[PDB]
Design a protein around this ligand. Structure first.
Ligand SMILES: Nc1ncnc2c1ncn2[C@H]1O[C@@H](CO)[C@H](O)[C@@H]1O
Ligand SMILES: Nc1ncnc2c1ncn2[C@H]1O[C@@H](CO)[C@H](O)[C@@H]1O
Ligand SMILES: [Au+3]
Ligand SMILES: [Au+3]
Ligand SMILES: [Au+]
Ligand SMILES: [Au+]
Ligand SMILES: [Mg+2]
Ligand SMILES: [Mg+2]
Ligand SMILES: [Mg+2]
Ligand SMILES: [Mg+2]
Lengths: 211, 211, 211, 211
C-alpha cells in the first residue's frame, strides 16, 4: 500500500499468467484412454457441491461470530440430512462424474464433514449427478476421531487412483498415497475463506472449475 | 459441443480486454463527494444476495422440469419468508451499503420477486448488512411481468438517483428515469443463466463484484 | 516474498479487474459523432510507433550502461533521420488515425524527442499511416530547452482537443489544458521501462492498444 | 469487420482459462535438477530476439507488397550481418540462457533463417545474453523449406534434449527427435502473424514469455 484510487495497470500485468498445469476434463479423459476401470474419489465441498448456503446458515444459526458450528453435532445433523437441497452442484463435477461413469469407474466421495447417525448426502449426490448405483458408493466421512480413518487411509483402502478436490489436504492426501491429485477451483463466493492457492503443489488444476 | 483438446492461446488473447467502464466502490464514493444525502436503490438477487440456493431448491420442489415455480405463490411465500437464510451476502454489497450509510443516503431494495402476504427479506438484509433503521427502507417487491420493466416506476416514485443491479432490466430501469445505473457481476455459479453481458449499455461495472 | 516455485492462484485473482475506464476506438468515434472537425494530437513513441529498436540500437551504440544516449545529439540525428524505418507501427494507431482522417480532423504529433536539424519522422508517419497532407502536420518536437515550448503549450497553441499517449506526462499535458487525454498501452517488450500505470489518473485507456 | 459497440463481458469469461501446461524458468530448472550438462537449443526469432524490426525493414525495402524478401539473398545478408542491432533481446531468453549456463549446458541456436556467406548473429547473441565461450555454439542456419521441418535433423545431430521456440515447427522438431519442446509466446507486436497457438500440442508454455 498505497492502494490508489486509480491504480491503473500495464500489459505485462494484463497478460501475466501464474505457472499452473491447467487441464480440461477432455484432457484428463484422453490421459485415461485404454486404462481399465478404476476407483476414483471426490471431495464434496466446493468440489462437486457449492454447499456454502448450508454452512452459512449453520454459522448464522449456531455460532454467528466464530467457526464453532463446525464442531456442533446439531449443525451436522442438519447439514448432512437435507441442507444440501440448497447446495448448488458444480458443472465441472457433472462433467467429471459423467466421464468416469462412461469409463465404468468406481466413484467414491470422501469428505471431512463430521459423521452423523444418518445422512442423505449419498442420495443427493447420486441423484443430482445421475450416478448409477453400480458406480456409486456411500459417502465416506473421513477424519481423526475414534472409529474414523483419515482421507489418506481411505484412498489407500479403496485403491483410489485419482482424487479431485479444492483444498490443499485433498491434494496432499492423494500425493501421500501415490494417487493423482487434481485440483478444483473454490468459487470466490464460497464462505470457506481464504481461497486455496490452486496449483500450490505443482498439481493439475481444472480450467473453469469454479462453477 | 466438442472443442479442441489442446486449443492453446496467444498473448493477444491473454491480454485482451473488453471496453468496459470498470469502477471501484472508492471511485463511486469519490464521484459523489460533496453530494448531500439522496435515495439510492439495489436489486436483490445476485446483486446483494447470492440467492440461487432458494431458487434452485424451489425449482426442484415446485417445478423440476420447468420454470413454473417462478409463478407459484407457494414458492414465493417460502422464498420471501426464510429461504434467504441460505442466501450468501455479497462482499461488494457490504462495501456499497457501508459507503451509502457513510453518505447518509436512503437505501431502497427494488426486487423483481413477487409480493407475498409477509416477507422476512427486509429483516435478513438489514441484519446481514448492518443497516441502520434510518437508512433502511422496507423491500419494494415490484414483481415480474415480461414485456414490462416493473422497477422503473418505483425508482421514479422513490427519487432513486443511483441503481445497482446485475441484470439488463436493472440498468434499463435506471436509464428510464435518468438515474445512474451501475452493474454488479452475476456469479458464475448462479443458477440464473445465461450470465448477463455486464457493460452492454456502456454503464459502469463494479470490479470484482461477483462475490 | 516468498515467490514460490508453485505459486498457484485462485478464481478471485483470475477474474480480478483493475478499475479502469477502458474504451475502444469504436466508442471514441461514437463519442465524437456530430462534433465538427477538430485538432487531435498523438505522442509518437509507444503510442503510434514501437520505436524501441532504434532506442535499443542507440543505447547499445552510444551509452551501453546508462541512458546518456537520450541526450546525445549524434543519437538523435540517427533516430530522427531513418532509424524509424525499423520502428513497428501500432495497429491501434492505424485505427485511430484512419478514423480521425475520416472525420476530417487535423492530426498533430507532439514528441519529447530532441529536435534535429532535419527529420524524416513526419514522412515515416504520413507514409505508414496513409495520412493525407491536408490532415498531416509536421512533427512538433516539444520541451524545455531554449527555443522550445512544452507539450502543454503546444496543445494549447494548436487547440488540440484529444491527446493520445502512453506516458503519464502525455495524459497530464492534456489535463493541464482541458483536453481529453487518452491512454495507449506501452508494449511489454518496450525498452522504456518500467511500464506506466495506464489509467493512473482515471483517464480512458484503449483496449488492446499494446500492438 | 464490425463488432458491438459495448459488448460487455461476464465473470465466466473474465476467469476463463485455456488448458495450458504453463511453466516457469524456475520450474524448468527444478525439473532438471541433478541432470548433468546436456545440449539444449533455442529458435532465434520471437524466442530470444524480437527481430521484427529487421524483417519489417526488409519487407519495405525488398518486397513492399509480398513476402519475396524472405527468399532474397540480399535481404539475408543484411538481416544476418547487422540488422539484429535493432533486434530486442527477450527477458525470458536472458533467464533461460542464464539458467542453462548455470547448468553447464551446451547452448545451440537453430534458426529457420537462410544461411549467408557471413553472419554476425552468433556474436550479437553471445554478447547480448552474456554467453560464455564454453556454452556458446555458432548459430545453425537451417533455412526454410515449406513442406519440410529443417530443424529436426539438427536437433538429432547435436543431441539437443530441450528445444525452445515460438512456432509450431519448433515444437514439432523437438517432438520428431523425442526432445522436450517448450513454447515461448510470440509478442503481439511481432510482424510475423498470425500468432501461433502456444500450447496447441499439449507442450509446456513459459509464462510471461512475450517479453
Ligand atoms: N465456511 C464453509 N463453507 C462451506 N463449506 C465448509 C466451510 N467450512 C468448512 N467447510 C467444509 O469443508 C470440510 C473440510 O474439512 C469441512 O469439514 C466442512 O464440511
Ligand atoms: N528506452 C526507450 N525505448 C523507446 N523509446 C524511448 C526510450 N526512452 C525514451 N524514449 C522516448 O520517449 C520520449 C519521451 O520523452 C523520449 O524523448 C524518447 O524519445
Ligand atoms: Au509437472
Ligand atoms: Au470517470
Ligand atoms: Au428471475
Ligand atoms: Au519466417
Ligand atoms: Mg472441499
Ligand atoms: Mg438481480
Ligand atoms: Mg510515448
Ligand atoms: Mg521463432
Amino acid at each position: 500500500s498505497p492502494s490508489p484510487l486509480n491504480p491503473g495497470t500495464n500489459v505485462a500485468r494484463l497478460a501475466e499468467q501464474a505457472p499452473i498445469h491447467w487441464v480440461s476434463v477432455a484432457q484428463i479423459e484422453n490421459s485415461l484412454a485404454g486404462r481399465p476401470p478404476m476407483a476414483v474419489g471426490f471431495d464434496i465441498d466446493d468440489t462437486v457441491l457449492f454447499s456454502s448456503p448450508g454452512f452459512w446458515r449453520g454459522k448464522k444459526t449456531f455460532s454467528p461470530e466464530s467457526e464453532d458450528y463446525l464442531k456442533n453435532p446439531v449443525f451436522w445433523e442438519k447439514m448432512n440430512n437435507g441442507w444440501d437441497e440448497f447446495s448448488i452442484p458444480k458443472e465441472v463435477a457433472r462433467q467429471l462424474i459423467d466421464m468416469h461413469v462412461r469409463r465404468g469407474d468406481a466413484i467414491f466421495f470422501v469428505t471431512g464433514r463430521s459423521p452423523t447417525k444418518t445422512e442423505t448426502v449419498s442420495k443427493t449426490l447420486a441423484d443430482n449427478f445421475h450416478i448409477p448405483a453400480t458406480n456409486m458408493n456411500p459417502v465416506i466421512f473421513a477424519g481423526d476421531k475414534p472409529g474414523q480413518n483419515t482421507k489418506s487411509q481411505w484412498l489407500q483402502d479403496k485403491n483410489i487412483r485419482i482424487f479431485y478436490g479444492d483444498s490443499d489436504n485433498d491434494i496432499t492426501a492423494a500425493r501421500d498415497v501415490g494417487a493423482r491429485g487434481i485440483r478444483i477451483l473454490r468459487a470466490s463466493n464460497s464462505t470457506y475463506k481464504p481461497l486455496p492457492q490452486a496449483g500450490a503443489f505443482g498439481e493439475e488444476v481444472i480450467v473453469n472449475s469454479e462453477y
